[PDB]
Enzyme design. Structure first.
Site: not given
Ligand SMILES: O=C(O)/C(S)=C/c1csc2ccccc12
Ligand SMILES: [Zn+2]
Ligand SMILES: [Zn+2]
Length: 218
Positions: A77, A79, A81, A140, A171
């Site tokens: 995805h 984001h 990470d 997610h 998040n």
């Molecule tokens: O909880 C996780 O696996 C990740 S990758 C959260 C996250 C990393 S930037 C971001 C921006 C908006 C909402 C969630 C997140």
């Molecule tokens: Zn994420």
């Molecule tokens: Zn993540």
């Protein structure tokens, strides 16, 4: 299982079987997991890491150890990470596979674009290593995919799947909490016999991690 770390301890690889390792990197502290697939035609990663510096270190560690080049990465995805090292991949000529939606979201968020070549189900083969990618629906994030290794019954759940240590969904700003349970159910319907499940963050587990995520969505 064998665990190997970098000089700083910010990058670790852990062996799941002869040709499958989990990579874990610490971002400022927050660990993230992906996979390293040691194939007869090169190394294939599932997911990069939080940023270009960590992605460079990861690639350099695995190329030295396995004595072959990283040729491809699957981005699960958009984001940081998962995609934070996309600039490094593209400048080194490493192919960065993704769905079209993940590519659109990457561009929307100002990252360089992955290929956008993966469909809802895609079957790839790298040397003798078979890899299936599956988009199960929103969870997610709107674009999250999972990766399945049918020769090992290993599922890379990514951030769709929470580890046992996760006591909440994290998040959810980009999440679809009323679709996420159906998306997990679609994974469970497609892969009825699972040997290991690798979550996006935390310890490797089994199908129980999917059931744990379902309970966190209640
Ligand atoms: O909880 C996780 O696996 C990740 S990758 C959260 C996250 C990393 S930037 C971001 C921006 C908006 C909402 C969630 C997140
Ligand atoms: Zn994420
Ligand atoms: Zn993540």
């Amino acid at each position: 299982k064998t665990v190997i770390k970098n000089e700083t301890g910010t990058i670790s690889i852990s062996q799941l079987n002869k040709n499958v390792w989990v990579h874990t990197e610490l971002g400022s502290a927050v660990p993230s997991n992906g996979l390293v697939l040691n194939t007869s035609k090169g190394l294939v990663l599932v997911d990069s890491s939080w940023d270009d510096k960590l992605t460079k270190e990861l690639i350099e560690m695995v190329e030295k150890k396995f004595q072959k080049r990283v040729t491809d990465v699957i981005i699960t995805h958009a984001h940081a990470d998962r995609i934070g090292g996309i600039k490094t991949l593209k400048e080194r000529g490493i192919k960065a596979h993704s769905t079209a939606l993940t590519a659109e979201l990457a561009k929307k968020n100002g990252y360089e674009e992955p290929l956008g070549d993966l469909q809802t189900v895609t079957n790839l083969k790298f040397g003798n290593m078979k890899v299936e990618t599956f988009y199960p629906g929103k969870g997610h994030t709107e674009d999250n995919i999972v990766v399945w290794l049918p020769q090992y019954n290993i599922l890379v759940g990514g951030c769709l799947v929470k580890s046992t240590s996760a006591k909440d969904l994290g998040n959810v700003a980009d999440a679809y909490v009323n679709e996420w349970s159906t998306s997990i159910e679609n994974v469970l319907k497609r892969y009825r016999n699972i040997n290991a499940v690798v979550p996006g963050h935390g310890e490797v587990g089994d199908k129980g991690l999917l059931l744990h995520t379902l309970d966190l969505l209640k």
